[PDB]
């Protein structure tokens, strides 16, 4: 229930970057650690993204649950 999600701008953000670099996600880590930041100030049922972006740290652990 997006009634306001801070950090929609961020996950729109990961897409912008990724057209600043031409879709190279490797570039937009950067950007991608942004949403980190964003989601990390809440709980994930204040945003929709942010709700993809806690379970993005699920799928970390394919990379390694801690390697950044």
Do not use: H, W
């Amino acid at each position: 229930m997006p009634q306001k999600d801070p950090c929609q701008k961020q996950a729109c953000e990961i897409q912008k970057c990724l057209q600043a670099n031409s879709y190279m996600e490797s570039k937009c880590q950067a950007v991608i650690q942004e949403l980190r930041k964003c989601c990390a100030q809440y709980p994930k049922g204040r945003s929709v993204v942010c709700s993809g972006f806690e379970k993005e740290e699920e799928e970390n652990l394919t990379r390694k649950s801690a390697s950044k």
